[PDB]
Enzyme design. Structure first.
Site, PDB file in Angstrom:
ATOM      1  N   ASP A  35       0.827  -1.174   0.154  1.00 10.35           N
ATOM      2  CA  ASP A  35       0.129   0.022   0.010  1.00 10.35           C
ATOM      3  C   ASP A  35       0.587   1.359  -0.067  1.00 10.35           C
ATOM      4  O   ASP A  35       1.294   1.720   1.079  1.00 10.35           O
ATOM      5  CB  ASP A  35      -1.093  -0.150   1.185  1.00 10.35           C
ATOM      6  CG  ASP A  35      -1.903   1.161   1.288  1.00 10.35           C
ATOM      7  OD1 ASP A  35      -2.043   2.053   0.123  1.00 10.35           O
ATOM      8  OD2 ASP A  35      -2.475   1.484   2.345  1.00 10.35           O
ATOM      9  N   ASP A  43      -1.446   5.330  -5.658  1.00  4.15           N
ATOM     10  CA  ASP A  43      -1.822   4.588  -4.576  1.00  4.15           C
ATOM     11  C   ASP A  43      -1.832   3.163  -4.923  1.00  4.15           C
ATOM     12  O   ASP A  43      -3.249   2.736  -5.515  1.00  4.15           O
ATOM     13  CB  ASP A  43      -3.026   5.024  -4.107  1.00  4.15           C
ATOM     14  CG  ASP A  43      -3.514   4.343  -2.908  1.00  4.15           C
ATOM     15  OD1 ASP A  43      -2.775   3.429  -2.155  1.00  4.15           O
ATOM     16  OD2 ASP A  43      -4.802   4.660  -2.413  1.00  4.15           O
TER      17      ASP A  43
END
Ligand SMILES: CC#Cc1cncc(-c2ccc3c(c2)[C@@]2(COC(N)=N2)c2cc(C4=CCOCC4)ncc2O3)c1
Length: 370
Positions: free
Chosen positions: A34, A220
């Site tokens: 992440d 992201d």
């Protein structure tokens, strides 16, 4: 870096994970990769969704920091107990580091029923770490405690199993074609960048570029969609609608309310437009552009698909829809992110994802929101 190739796995819509070990002796866990957060946090209790969890009582190297951490986020929450322990990545560099680990002890809508991961590896910067910027993120500890260079790159490939590569400390040149093009990390918190122009099938949206980065744009790996600020989403959909008017779909489809289907093997890729984001370049008045296909923004679920572009109140999020087209280099050392055409991106005989430049773009600093 051949050891690190293909070290990422997942299922569509459930993220990309990497195998890690924690503690002594090592406990193996699969961990979500992440770039949109900054904590290393692992299941530490027998939640029914979990294949496994961190058992601190079995680790001779575990150290209790005697502090809680409470992390609500937009789509869920987790809470846990801070500590440190030895951490390695079997299909990563041949090193082991003492890192901060949040042992997750309560959660809501965090773990996914049916997923194969048990924790989250926040690769973004200390500024957004919980509880505060004093909790050193994993990657910072890795670089500080070893000779691993201060950069990592991600090749996310997609399809239902997905796969990819996280190259830690380097770049694997077999994972991309053509050249890398770099855009500055505007600020070290999220991996924040600045979009300076948007095109649908080569047609400029003609919006004030600040709108494209209101209130930020980020890269992201923990988000599936390309998310766009509301006003920019309106214009993008209006243009994509117009471009794709050969075939009529319900208004709900564009809002992610329903799927659209075609006979197996007859998806009309060609009626759908390409989407280009121009990013701020490395030189004054110089930009480059990255271009994705409907193969990227129409996601499998007859062959049925979800429209995977959506509106945001938190700025542009360049999620898997963008990243699956490109090899993406998180050059922390030089505060820049590289894009190159991915050797694994899905495409057809007519069009491929592209990274092109240089272009002349003026007033690119005015595009950033303050
Ligand atoms: C590609 C992909 C994907 C994907 C699919 N399903 C679920 C997730 C997922 C699961 C847990 C999770 C997050 C995503 C997520 C949401 O967005 C991002 N970037 N990470 C996340 C973010 C955070 C943050 C904490 C504080 O602010 C920053 C972010 N904390 C926990 C999280 O858990 C990712």
């Amino acid at each position: 870096f051949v050891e690190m190739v293909d070290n990422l796995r997942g299922k569509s819509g459930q993220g990309y994970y990497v195998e890690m070990t924690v503690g002594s002796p090592p406990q193996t866990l699969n961990i979500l990769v992440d770039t949109g957060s900054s904590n290393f946090a692992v299941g530490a209790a027998p939640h029914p969704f979990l294949h496994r969890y961190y058992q601190r009582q079995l680790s001779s190297t575990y150290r209790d920091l005697r502090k809680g951490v409470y992390v609500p986020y937009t789509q869920g929450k987790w809470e846990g107990e801070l500590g440190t322990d030895l951490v390695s990545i079997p299909h990563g560099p041949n090193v082991t580091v003492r890192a901060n680990i949040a042992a997750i002890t309560e959660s809501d809508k965090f773990f996914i029923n049916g997923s194969n991961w048990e924790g989250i590896l926040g690769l973004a910067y200390a500024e957004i770490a919980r509880p505060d910027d004093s909790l050193e993120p994993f990657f910072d500890s890795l670089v500080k405690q070893t000779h691993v260079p201060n950069l990592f790159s991600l090749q996310l490939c997609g399809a239902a199993s997905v796969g990819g590569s996280m190259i830690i400390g380097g770049i694997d040149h077999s994972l991309y074609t053509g050249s890398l093009w770099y855009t500055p990390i505007r600020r070290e918190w999220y991996y924040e960048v600045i979009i300076v122009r948007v095109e649908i099938n080569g047609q400029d949206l003609k919006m004030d570029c600040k709108e494209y980065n209101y209130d930020k744009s980020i890269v992201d790996s923990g988000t599936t969609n390309l998310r766009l600020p509301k006003k920019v989403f309106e214009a993008a959909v209006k243009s994509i609608k117009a471009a794709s008017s050969t075939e009529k779909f319900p208004d709900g489809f564009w809002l992610g309310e329903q799927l659209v289907c075609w006979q197996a093997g007859t998806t009309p890729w060609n009626i759908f437009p390409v989407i280009s984001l121009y990013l701020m370049g490395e030189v004054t008045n110089q930009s480059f552009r990255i271009t994705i296909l409907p193969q990227q923004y129409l996601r499998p679920v007859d062959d049925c698909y979800k429209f995977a572009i959506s509106q945001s109140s938190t700025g542009t999020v360049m999620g898997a829809v963008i990243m699956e087209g490109f090899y993406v280099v998180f050059d922390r050392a030089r505060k820049r992110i590289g894009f190159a055409v991915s050797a694994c991106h899905v495409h057809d005989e007519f069009r491929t994802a592209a990274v092109e430049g240089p272009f002349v773009t003026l007033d690119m600093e005015d595009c950033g929101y303050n």
